[PDB]
Amino acid sequence: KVFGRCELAAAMKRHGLDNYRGYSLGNWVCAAKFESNFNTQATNRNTDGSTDYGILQINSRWWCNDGRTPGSRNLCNIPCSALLSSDITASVNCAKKIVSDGNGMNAWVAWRNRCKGTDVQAWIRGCRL
Ligand SMILES: [Cl-]
Ligand SMILES: [Cl-]
Ligand SMILES: [Cl-]
Ligand SMILES: [Cl-]
Ligand SMILES: [Cl-]
Ligand code: NA
Ligand SMILES: [Pt+2]
């Protein structure tokens, strides 16, 4: 599914991401924009042979199992394919664990380089939340 920007904000809100660990909704929308362009089916291979999956590009090195990332963990206890569903529940639950883990949203490289410190409220402007 390719979410619309306000559509995604709504789903994230409903799933309790708005202000989760102190990160406002626009942070999560901005991260999603630059990680996946709001596409739940997005996949991208990392240099190390791990892969990032879904709307928030959750990477199999630590968080989900794809069966092809040697030495990796599956700290969200999910198949990585669950992170590609049209339903974002699994991605949001796993993102909550990621962002609780000590480095906050800096775990998302595109957040750090493209969202952090910017006017992220722009991402939820005009949405009916
Ligand atoms: Cl915001
Ligand atoms: Cl693996
Ligand atoms: Cl699995
Ligand atoms: Cl959803
Ligand atoms: Cl933080
Ligand atoms: Na893994
Ligand atoms: Pt939920």
mmCIF file of C-alpha atoms and ligand atoms in Angstrom:
data_model
loop_
_atom_site.group_PDB
_atom_site.id
_atom_site.type_symbol
_atom_site.label_atom_id
_atom_site.label_comp_id
_atom_site.label_asym_id
_atom_site.label_seq_id
_atom_site.Cartn_x
_atom_site.Cartn_y
_atom_site.Cartn_z
ATOM 1 C CA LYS A 1 0.000 0.000 0.000
ATOM 2 C CA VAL A 2 1.204 3.527 -0.728
ATOM 3 C CA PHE A 3 -0.240 5.637 2.059
ATOM 4 C CA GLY A 4 -1.219 9.146 1.700
ATOM 5 C CA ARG A 5 0.542 11.532 4.048
ATOM 6 C CA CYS A 6 -2.529 12.306 6.285
ATOM 7 C CA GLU A 7 -3.746 8.736 5.951
ATOM 8 C CA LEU A 8 -0.450 7.570 7.417
ATOM 9 C CA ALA A 9 -0.508 10.167 10.177
ATOM 10 C CA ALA A 10 -3.903 8.918 11.145
ATOM 11 C CA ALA A 11 -2.888 5.322 11.261
ATOM 12 C CA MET A 12 0.229 6.090 13.268
ATOM 13 C CA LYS A 13 -1.825 8.157 15.740
ATOM 14 C CA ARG A 14 -4.389 5.391 16.107
ATOM 15 C CA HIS A 15 -1.582 2.982 16.872
ATOM 16 C CA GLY A 16 -0.115 5.278 19.605
ATOM 17 C CA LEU A 17 3.041 6.628 17.898
ATOM 18 C CA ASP A 18 2.125 10.351 18.356
ATOM 19 C CA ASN A 19 4.527 11.482 21.074
ATOM 20 C CA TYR A 20 5.806 7.947 21.733
ATOM 21 C CA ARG A 21 9.126 8.362 23.638
ATOM 22 C CA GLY A 22 8.534 12.063 23.105
ATOM 23 C CA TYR A 23 8.587 12.048 19.322
ATOM 24 C CA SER A 24 5.728 14.010 17.821
ATOM 25 C CA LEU A 25 3.649 12.614 14.965
ATOM 26 C CA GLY A 26 5.402 14.660 12.303
ATOM 27 C CA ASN A 27 8.740 13.036 13.216
ATOM 28 C CA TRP A 28 7.252 9.598 12.437
ATOM 29 C CA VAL A 29 5.629 10.810 9.204
ATOM 30 C CA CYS A 30 8.821 12.506 8.057
ATOM 31 C CA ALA A 31 10.810 9.315 8.863
ATOM 32 C CA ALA A 32 8.319 7.245 6.841
ATOM 33 C CA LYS A 33 8.529 9.660 3.902
ATOM 34 C CA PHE A 34 12.279 9.441 3.607
ATOM 35 C CA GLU A 35 12.620 5.740 4.566
ATOM 36 C CA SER A 36 9.927 4.301 2.267
ATOM 37 C CA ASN A 37 8.055 7.128 0.482
ATOM 38 C CA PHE A 38 5.003 5.870 2.371
ATOM 39 C CA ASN A 39 5.182 2.452 0.622
ATOM 40 C CA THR A 40 4.535 -0.530 2.934
ATOM 41 C CA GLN A 41 6.161 -2.868 0.407
ATOM 42 C CA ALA A 42 9.495 -1.079 0.334
ATOM 43 C CA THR A 43 12.615 -3.232 0.725
ATOM 44 C CA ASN A 44 16.251 -2.128 0.546
ATOM 45 C CA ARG A 45 19.446 -4.211 0.909
ATOM 46 C CA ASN A 46 22.146 -2.820 3.222
ATOM 47 C CA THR A 47 25.881 -3.125 2.585
ATOM 48 C CA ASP A 48 26.251 -5.695 5.295
ATOM 49 C CA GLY A 49 23.708 -8.063 3.631
ATOM 50 C CA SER A 50 20.895 -7.212 6.050
ATOM 51 C CA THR A 51 17.718 -5.790 4.528
ATOM 52 C CA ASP A 52 15.352 -2.987 5.633
ATOM 53 C CA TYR A 53 11.603 -3.716 5.370
ATOM 54 C CA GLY A 54 8.421 -1.647 5.132
ATOM 55 C CA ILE A 55 7.085 1.749 5.886
ATOM 56 C CA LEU A 56 9.826 2.400 8.493
ATOM 57 C CA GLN A 57 12.629 0.323 6.930
ATOM 58 C CA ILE A 58 13.154 -1.968 9.909
ATOM 59 C CA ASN A 59 16.353 -3.856 9.415
ATOM 60 C CA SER A 60 16.806 -7.593 9.750
ATOM 61 C CA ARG A 61 20.345 -7.151 11.406
ATOM 62 C CA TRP A 62 18.486 -6.702 14.715
ATOM 63 C CA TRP A 63 14.722 -6.600 14.565
ATOM 64 C CA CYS A 64 12.994 -9.183 12.343
ATOM 65 C CA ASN A 65 13.853 -12.542 10.846
ATOM 66 C CA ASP A 66 14.320 -12.926 7.079
ATOM 67 C CA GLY A 67 16.413 -16.107 7.206
ATOM 68 C CA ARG A 68 19.241 -14.587 5.226
ATOM 69 C CA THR A 69 21.041 -12.259 7.683
ATOM 70 C CA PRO A 70 23.801 -14.252 9.396
ATOM 71 C CA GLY A 71 24.410 -13.553 12.940
ATOM 72 C CA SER A 72 21.433 -11.306 13.219
ATOM 73 C CA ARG A 73 18.803 -11.011 15.879
ATOM 74 C CA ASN A 74 14.982 -10.830 15.689
ATOM 75 C CA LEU A 75 14.237 -8.591 18.666
ATOM 76 C CA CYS A 76 10.678 -7.851 17.450
ATOM 77 C CA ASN A 77 10.023 -11.619 17.122
ATOM 78 C CA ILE A 78 8.440 -11.324 13.699
ATOM 79 C CA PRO A 79 9.124 -12.412 10.174
ATOM 80 C CA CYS A 80 10.393 -9.426 8.196
ATOM 81 C CA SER A 81 7.606 -10.073 5.646
ATOM 82 C CA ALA A 82 5.071 -9.012 8.403
ATOM 83 C CA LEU A 83 6.572 -5.559 8.148
ATOM 84 C CA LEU A 84 5.358 -5.279 4.542
ATOM 85 C CA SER A 85 1.631 -5.625 5.177
ATOM 86 C CA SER A 86 -0.921 -3.000 4.241
ATOM 87 C CA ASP A 87 -1.718 -2.933 7.962
ATOM 88 C CA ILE A 88 1.017 -1.069 9.852
ATOM 89 C CA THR A 89 0.409 -2.684 13.273
ATOM 90 C CA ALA A 90 3.509 -4.895 13.148
ATOM 91 C CA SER A 91 5.765 -2.066 11.937
ATOM 92 C CA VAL A 92 4.517 0.331 14.658
ATOM 93 C CA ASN A 93 4.912 -2.268 17.479
ATOM 94 C CA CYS A 94 8.433 -2.972 16.363
ATOM 95 C CA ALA A 95 9.285 0.757 15.935
ATOM 96 C CA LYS A 96 8.177 1.279 19.553
ATOM 97 C CA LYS A 97 10.742 -1.253 20.696
ATOM 98 C CA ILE A 98 13.463 0.306 18.427
ATOM 99 C CA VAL A 99 12.950 3.868 19.668
ATOM 100 C CA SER A 100 12.907 2.714 23.321
ATOM 101 C CA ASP A 101 16.381 1.125 22.960
ATOM 102 C CA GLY A 102 18.656 4.075 23.869
ATOM 103 C CA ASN A 103 19.315 6.149 20.711
ATOM 104 C CA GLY A 104 15.757 7.246 20.140
ATOM 105 C CA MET A 105 14.931 8.040 16.473
ATOM 106 C CA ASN A 106 18.652 8.371 15.524
ATOM 107 C CA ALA A 107 18.382 4.632 14.775
ATOM 108 C CA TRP A 108 16.685 5.802 11.526
ATOM 109 C CA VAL A 109 19.480 7.241 9.464
ATOM 110 C CA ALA A 110 17.074 9.176 7.160
ATOM 111 C CA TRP A 111 15.336 10.631 10.214
ATOM 112 C CA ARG A 112 18.695 11.899 11.592
ATOM 113 C CA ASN A 113 19.873 13.320 8.291
ATOM 114 C CA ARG A 114 16.553 14.609 6.851
ATOM 115 C CA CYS A 115 14.036 15.150 9.643
ATOM 116 C CA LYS A 116 15.877 15.799 12.918
ATOM 117 C CA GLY A 117 15.755 19.506 13.779
ATOM 118 C CA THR A 118 13.493 20.491 10.865
ATOM 119 C CA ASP A 119 9.942 21.716 10.886
ATOM 120 C CA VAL A 120 8.461 18.237 11.128
ATOM 121 C CA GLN A 121 4.993 19.593 11.998
ATOM 122 C CA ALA A 122 4.737 20.413 8.246
ATOM 123 C CA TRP A 123 4.249 16.689 7.681
ATOM 124 C CA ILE A 124 0.903 16.715 9.519
ATOM 125 C CA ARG A 125 -0.241 20.175 8.257
ATOM 126 C CA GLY A 126 -3.855 20.105 7.042
ATOM 127 C CA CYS A 127 -4.505 16.613 8.338
ATOM 128 C CA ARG A 128 -7.741 16.038 10.219
ATOM 129 C CA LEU A 129 -6.295 14.304 13.325
HETATM 130 CL CL CL B 1 4.624 17.166 14.698
HETATM 131 CL CL CL B 2 18.772 -14.767 9.539
HETATM 132 CL CL CL B 3 10.232 -15.922 11.069
HETATM 133 CL CL CL B 4 -2.913 0.439 9.234
HETATM 134 CL CL CL B 5 15.082 10.556 22.745
HETATM 135 NA NA NA B 6 17.306 -11.020 11.812
HETATM 136 PT PT PT B 7 -1.834 -0.639 17.511
#
